[PDB]
Each structure stands twice: as C-alpha cells, then as structure tokens.
Amino acid sequence: AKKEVAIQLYSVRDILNKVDNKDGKCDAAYITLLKNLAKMGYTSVEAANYNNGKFYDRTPDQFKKDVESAGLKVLSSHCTRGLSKEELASGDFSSSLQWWDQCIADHKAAGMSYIVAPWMDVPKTLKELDTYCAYYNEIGKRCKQQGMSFGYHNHAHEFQKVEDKVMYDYMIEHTNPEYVFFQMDVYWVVRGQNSPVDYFNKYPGRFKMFHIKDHREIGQSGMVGFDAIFKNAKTAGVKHLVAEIESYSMPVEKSVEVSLDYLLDAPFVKSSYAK
Amino acid sequence: AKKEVAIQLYSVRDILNKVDNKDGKCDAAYITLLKNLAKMGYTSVEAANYNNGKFYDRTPDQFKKDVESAGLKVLSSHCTRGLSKEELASGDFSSSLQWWDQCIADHKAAGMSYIVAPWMDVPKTLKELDTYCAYYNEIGKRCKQQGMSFGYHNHAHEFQKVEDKVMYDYMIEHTNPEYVFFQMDVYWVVRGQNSPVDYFNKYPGRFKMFHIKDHREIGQSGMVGFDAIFKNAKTAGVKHLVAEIESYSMPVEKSVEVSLDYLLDAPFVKSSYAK
Ligand SMILES: O=C1[C@H](O)CO[C@@H](CO)[C@@H]1O
Ligand SMILES: O=C1[C@H](O)CO[C@@H](CO)[C@@H]1O
Numbered sequence: 001a002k003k004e005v006a007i008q009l010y011s012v013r014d015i016l017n018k019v020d021n022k023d024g025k026c027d028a029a030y031i032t033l034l035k036n037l038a039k040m041g042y043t044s045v046e047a048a049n050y051n052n053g054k055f056y057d058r059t060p061d062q063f064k065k066d067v068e069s070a071g072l073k074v075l076s077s078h079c080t081r082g083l084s085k086e087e088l089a090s091g092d093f094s095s096s097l098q099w100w101d102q103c104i105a106d107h108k109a110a111g112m113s114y115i116v117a118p119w120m121d122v123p124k125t126l127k128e129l130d131t132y133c134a135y136y137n138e139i140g141k142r143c144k145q146q147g148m149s150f151g152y153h154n155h156a157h158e159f160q161k162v163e164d165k166v167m168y169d170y171m172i173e174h175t176n177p178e179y180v181f182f183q184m185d186v187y188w189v190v191r192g193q194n195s196p197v198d199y200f201n202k203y204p205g206r207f208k209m210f211h212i213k214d215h216r217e218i219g220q221s222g223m224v225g226f227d228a229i230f231k232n233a234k235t236a237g238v239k240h241l242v243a244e245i246e247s248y249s250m251p252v253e254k255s256v257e258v259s260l261d262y263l264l265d266a267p268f269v270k271s272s273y274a275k
Numbered sequence: 276a277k278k279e280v281a282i283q284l285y286s287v288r289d290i291l292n293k294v295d296n297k298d299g300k301c302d303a304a305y306i307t308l309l310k311n312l313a314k315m316g317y318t319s320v321e322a323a324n325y326n327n328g329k330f331y332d333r334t335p336d337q338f339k340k341d342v343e344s345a346g347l348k349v350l351s352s353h354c355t356r357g358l359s360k361e362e363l364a365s366g367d368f369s370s371s372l373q374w375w376d377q378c379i380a381d382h383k384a385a386g387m388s389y390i391v392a393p394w395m396d397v398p399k400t401l402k403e404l405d406t407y408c409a410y411y412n413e414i415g416k417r418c419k420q421q422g423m424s425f426g427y428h429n430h431a432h433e434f435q436k437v438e439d440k441v442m443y444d445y446m447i448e449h450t451n452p453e454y455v456f457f458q459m460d461v462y463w464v465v466r467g468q469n470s471p472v473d474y475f476n477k478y479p480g481r482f483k484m485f486h487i488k489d490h491r492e493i494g495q496s497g498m499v500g501f502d503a504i505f506k507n508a509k510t511a512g513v514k515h516l517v518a519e520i521e522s523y524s525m526p527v528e529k530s531v532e533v534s535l536d537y538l539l540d541a542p543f544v545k546s547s548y549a550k
C-alpha cells in the first residue's frame with residue numbers, strides 16, 4: 001500500500017552522525033541510507049541537521065539532489081534559534097531574524113516546504129511567551145515570503161502552565177494561523193497527559209503536520225491512540241505525516257521500516273493528506 | 276456485532292448513587308438502568324458498590340436476580356480492605372481475612388466470577404508491599420476455594436518506585452499467578468507513562484481482565500493505543516473486558532453506549548476472550 005509518510009532523519013541519527021561529507025566528500029553510507037529509506041516506502045524526509053549553511057555537511061542544493069535522486073521529497077526540517085535575554089527584554093529580535101533569513105534561504109534552496117522549530121524552553125512569564133509568539137509570527141511570514149510554512153513542534157513540557165495559562169494553548173491562541181502551524185507530536189501530547197483529539201476540536205486546522213512517534217516502534221506500545229487521531233485528521237488540518245523512531249526493539253533500519261509498515265497497514269491512515 | 280463487554284457500574288454512579296433500594300424497596304430506576312445497559316449490548320456488569328453484605332442495597336441473591344433478569348451476567352466487583360498499621364507491622368492479617376470471608380461468601384452468592392481490589396496506597400517500604408502481596412495471595416486462595424478469581428486493579432501511582440523498585444512490577448513478581456491476576460487499567464498505565472504491551476510481554480498471562488477506559492468516551496481521545504493492546508491480548512492472557520466511563524461529553528447513558536459502540540465496531544476487538 002503506497003502512502004505519503006516522511007521520515008524524521010533523527011530516527012537514523014546513529015548512521016548519520018558518523019557519515020563524513022566533509023572536505024568535498026559524499027559518504028556512500030549517507031546515499032545508501034537515503035536510498036534504503038525510499039525502498040522501505042518513505043516518500044519524503046524531515047531533516048534534523050542544519051548547521052553552517054549545510055544539511056549533514058551538504059549544501060542545500062546538494063541535499064536536494066541527494067534526497068531527490070534517492071526517490072524522496074525534501075519535505076521539512078527541524079531547526080530553530082532561541083531569543084537572547086536581551087531580545088526578550090527589549091522585544092527586538094532583529095538579530096535573530098537575520099539568522100532566520102539565512103536559514104530560510106537555505107531551506108528554500110533545498111526544496112523544503114516546511115521549517116519547524118523542534119523545541120523551545122518553558123519561559124518564566126507570559127510576557128516572554130508572548131514575545132516568542134511574535135517572533136514565530138515574523139519567522140513564519142518570512143518563510144511564506146520564501147515559499148514555505150513555519151511550524152512549531154511540541155514535547156510534553158508545553159502542557160505545563162506559565163503564570164496560570166497552559167503554554168501550548170497560549171502559543172496556539174497568540175500566533176497567526178497563516179504563519180505558524182503546530183506540528184503536533186501526538187506521542188508527547190499523550191505523555192503530557194492530554195488529548196490530541198481535544199486539541200484538534202478546540203483549534204481546528206492548526207495542526208498541519210503530525211509527528212507520528214511511539215515509545216519504540218510506531219504503533220507497538222499501546223501508548224498512542226492513532227486510530228482516534230487519524231479518524232479526526234480532517235479537523236486537525238493535517239497535510240503531512242512525519243514518522244519518528246528514536247528508541248528501538250531491533251536494528252535501527254528494521255525498526256524504522258516496521259514503524260512505517262504499521263502506518264501502511266493501518267486502514268485509518270489515508271494514502272495522502274495533501275490531495 | 277455482538278461482543279462480550281462488561282460495564283463497570285461506576286460508570287453510571289450518577290444514577291445508582293440516588294436509587295433507593297432501602298427498607299425492602301426495589302427502585303424502578305435501578306432495574307431500568309440494568310435493562311438499558313443490556314439493551315445497549317453490554318453482556319455483564321462489574322459492581323462498584325459492596326457495603327453491609329449488599330450490592331446497591333440488594334442482597335447478593337437479589338443482585339444476581341436483578342442483573343440476570345435484565346439479560347446481564349454478574350461478572351465482577353471492585354472492593355477491597357486495606358491492612359491496619361498493626362497488621363502490617365505484625366504481618367498477621369487474620370482480622371482482615373475474616374472480612375474477606377464474608378465478602379467472598381457474598382460474592383459467590385451473587386454469581387460473581389471475579390473480585391478485584393480497586394486501589395491500594397503506595398506503601399512506604401518494600402516490606403509493607405511484600406505483606407500486601409502475601410495478603411493478596413491468601414485472599415486469592417480463598418476466592419478460588421469459593422469458585423472465583425481475585426485480581427488487582429491499577430491506576431498510575433503503581434508505576435512509581437518504592438525503595439528502588441517499581442511497585443507494579445514488584446506486585447506482579449511477588450504474587451502467585453494462580454491466585455492473583457492484574458486487571459490492567461490500560462488508560463492509567465499510559466497516563467503513568469508506561470506501555471501496556473511491554474507489561475504483557477514481560478509478564479505474559481497475568482492480565483486476565485482489562486479495564487477499557489479513556490479520557491472520556493472510550494476510543495475518542497487519542498490517548499490509548501487500543502489497537503496495539505488488543506493485538507497483544509493473547510500474550511496478556513485477557514479473558515474479559517470491562518468498559519468504564521467516568522467523564523462524559525454527552526448524557527451519561529449515551530456516553531456509555533457510544534463507548535461500547537467503539538469496541539463493537541473495532542475490528543481488533545474479538546467477540547469473546549473466554550472461548
Ligand atoms: O522527536 C524528536 C525528539 O524527541 C526531539 O525533538 C525533535 C527534534 O528533531 C525530534 O524529532
Ligand atoms: O476506574 C475507576 C476509578 O478510576 C477508580 O477505581 C476503580 C474502582 O471502581 C474504577 O473502576
């Protein structure tokens with residue numbers, strides 16, 4: 001069964017952390033990995049390495065060619081830059097936006113459709129969280145001006161309160177839906193004691209990507225109600241699914257492949273969310 | 276689709292807490308409730324009220340007749356009695372076992388197949404937890420001598436450590452499988468940050484009943500991977516499913532019925548676990 005599913009490359013970090021694309025080289029193990037991921041049936045990647053204008057020590061144009069030639073789309077990337085104490089205090093985030101301009105140019109050239117902040121710290125005050133919301137709106141606008149969408153990926157910590165407000169809820173309510181979506185990591189929502197579906201119903205259309213992760217292999221633990229999540233996918237607004245596997249019951253590549261196979265065999269997972 | 280599913284009567288406590296079966300009466304609202312639960316398609320009940328030799332102010336023989344005449348089996352009951360500081364210190368739990376003798380006689384007469392302790396406190400030491408394990412073994416033996424099985428129902432607190440050992444694991448490892456099973460409340464395992472399936476694989480056959488609960492209606496939240504749980508049901512050793520619904524999106528009776536309908540429509544829920 002062919003379905004659109006991205007792989008978060010963090011899932012294969014054990015291979016990718018050791019590949020040597022420095023000093024003009026292209027590591028055959030890097031290319032082989034990409035080709036194997038396509039052969040498993042992944043349709044696209046989400047990067048988890050962006051540093052010094054490069055993805056896994058490849059220029060954006062190289063990364064594009066590498067991924068596309070393996071039969072994969074360049075879908076998304078996890079990267080962000082936090083605000084300085086200064087920026088937070090002044091609310092002036094010019095400095096940080098300059099970095100984003102370079103980040104965004106690089107992502108565009110790699111053929112990315114999305115850029116997603118993986119993490120932010122729980123701030124001390126709602127005022128700080130507010131500044132972050134404004135910064136994300138502006139990053140998101142710049143992404144759109146360069147053909148891409150910006151989103152925010154959660155763990156569990158966002159379900160805590162800042163002053164007396166749940167951080168996640170506040171972030172959703174104070175970001176412009178045109179410019180910021182939420183890449184809901186459903187596993188982490190459940191770990192954070194919350195209901196993916198209730199979030200979908202309360203903020204329909206904001207969850208344009210899912211991170212589909214589990215305790216180990218996807219769909220194995222009993223810890224994530226994928227069936228209910230997918231049944232409510234229309235309300236969520238999801239357009240792409242990103243599989244992530246960071247902890248394993250078996251060899252990594254095999255783990256990543258059986259994880260996919262869960263989604264391909266699941267009758268409630270449609271073959272595309274972007275038709 | 277007919278399947279065997281019990282209803283935990285705690286789910287309809289709002290009705291049952293107000294019914295008047297005192298002074299020789301049989302409340303028509305009580306009987307109607309039972310009949311409605313059968314009409315929804317529940318096949319059996321698990322009681323959540325045992326006090327003064329009675330179930331909802333009915334003698335065991337009356338309760339049996341009440342439930343059975345509505346078209347339901349009397350499957351199980353939630354009740355327990357904790358040990359005194361004395362009993363824990365001496366390790367002599369005669370006093371408590373006397374109560375259990377009466378409890379067990381009453382359960383037998385009601386036609387019960389199972390008796391399940393709903394709750395115990397996290398003890399201070401492994402020595403206390405040990406005494407509890409021995410007490411449960413002896414309760415369980417008495418239950419078997421009277422034709423029934425004793426089990427232990429979890430929330431999330433059992434996933435904490437006592438000295439340096441997870442309480443749940445210790446309880447499982449230090450109880451006799453003949454005499455104590457675990458009524459795994461899969462929702463609470465997941466809330467307690469753990470994997471139902473991993474518990475099944477680590478302690479196959481110990482989980483002879485499931486409590487099938489969710490945040491509100493069963494199967495609605497995204498918070499419980501029922502599909503994976505049920506796929507691994509053989510390893511668990513489950514023989515009966517008990518639906519519980521304690522928090523509602525709609526009127527109680529309707530909530531309880533749509534909760535069931537999730538299981539009846541779920542292809543991974545078999546029509547019986549006791550064939
Ligand atoms: O799921 C994960 C990790 O839990 C950490 O955050 C994300 C950043 O790449 C990643 O995909
Ligand atoms: O699920 C529940 C509650 O969460 C409390 O424990 C059980 C006792 O009847 C009940 O079925």
Ligand SMILES: [Co+2]
Nearest residue numbers: 185211213244
């Ligand atoms: Co993730």
Ligand SMILES: [Co+2]
Nearest residue numbers: 460486488519
């Ligand atoms: Co329960």
